[PDB]
Amino acid sequence: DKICLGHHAVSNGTKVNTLTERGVEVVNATETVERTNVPRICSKGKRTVDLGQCGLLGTITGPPQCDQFLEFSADLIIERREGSDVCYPGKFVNEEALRQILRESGGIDKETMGFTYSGIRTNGTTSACRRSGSSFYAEMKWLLSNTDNAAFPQMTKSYKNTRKDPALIIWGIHHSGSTTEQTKLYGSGNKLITVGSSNYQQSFVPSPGARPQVNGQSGRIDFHWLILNPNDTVTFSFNGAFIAPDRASFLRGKSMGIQSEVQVDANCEGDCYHSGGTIISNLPFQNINSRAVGKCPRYVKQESLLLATGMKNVPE
């Protein structure tokens, strides 16, 4: 008598939204927003350097924490919350920029600057950088007068980047703990330090004077920096309070940097990272962390957004 056509259905479907109706039941649907985190840095197949006690900026100047990091290579660089840039109390000026550069460096390669010195001390140290006795920043030299009180000479060290790539250059200004602490180290008289290239002009005066002790020192050493272009030349001129670079730093390639609080795992694999782990997913969006970095799903406010993968569902 009769032939009839028809479509399938199921006893429990799932609610999606449409242009026109909320919570319309379809037969099958699928999630579009990643909510699942992996509480580990999934590092498989990436050259990894977990800095631990060493602060990223440390890798440039070289406090004891960073000795094992003066010349690394990396695809992925991990800063820890207990990282530390500094042995002798002081700061990097314009630090976050520097960090941003270093994070994508692909690592660093040191080269001597070929400075040599005459009629001055080179070997100044501090009990603040402990290495079997007072030591100092491994990449730097504390330049001193020859004897207490004696007059530091008006010096000029210059350095030409003869490599194909930009050089990262660092120096330091020493702020002594007193005016006489200064004059005892570098001689009496108003001190000055200037640093020039073709894109860089700036001068520095030390500010000797009373500070609280940090790590038992009232002095401060503050680091300044610049990118030297292929074929351009830095000149340093000075007459004291100067912490000279021994080596320049060249960046190796490409890397990403992240800050994390979780263990590394060389067994899982992801490109999207945040302080509490890796987001592994194909889904277009994610509701885990708005500050994830890497190649990520796009972060969204919504916790769930279901995409219909079947027809209107219609039960008996």
Binding site: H7, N282, L305, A308, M311
Partner: protein, 170 residues
């Protein structure tokens, strides 16, 4: 809802049709039967998979920290970065919810359409030998056996072969 088949003039769906999306259920002299249509099912599935492949997509685009969770960046630039990030979050949330609503609207209608395409092809097949009763059935106006059913399904049913009989019954 756009083509008026599913939840339209067809009353509902068949929970006991496990082997496809669209199908035929018949009644005749020999007995009753249920067997799915492959080409229309495949057609829908193929479109839905087409969607998924487009959306379950990976952005090859790398972003880096401009930000610092351990020591906070200077506040002023801090606040610009946040205002931008929050600005993008607004855009992407709007985009996501729109894309999903629109896709669904389209998927649902996609499915309605295929049903209504199956129907109309059969109706065309049977020419003048049957009648639309109007709940997605064709009342055949001639005795038609279980090899006559399977000739409709795989699209061979020759109309003028039973034409005279049925036209007489009408």
């Amino acid at each position: 809802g756009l083509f008026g088949a599913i939840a339209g003039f067809i009353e509902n769906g068949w929970e006991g049709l496990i082997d496809g999306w669209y199908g035929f259920r018949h009644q005749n002299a020999q007995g009753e039967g249920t067997a799915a249509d492959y080409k229309s099912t495949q057609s829908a599935i193929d479109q839905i998979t087409g969607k998924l492949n487009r959306l379950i997509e990976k952005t090859n685009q790398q972003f880096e920290l401009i930000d610092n969770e351990f020591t906070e960046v200077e506040r002023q630039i801090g606040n610009v970065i946040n205002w931008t990030r929050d600005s993008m979050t607004e855009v992407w949330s709007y985009n996501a919810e729109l894309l999903v609503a629109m896709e669904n609207q389209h998927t649902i209608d996609l499915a309605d359409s295929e049903m209504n395409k199956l129907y109309e092809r059969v109706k065309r097949q049977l020419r003048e030998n049957a009648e639309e009763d109007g709940t997605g059935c064709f009342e055949i106006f001639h005795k038609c056996d279980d090899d006559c059913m399977a000739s409709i399904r795989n699209n061979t049913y020759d109309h003028s072969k039973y034409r005279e009989e049925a036209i007489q019954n009408r």
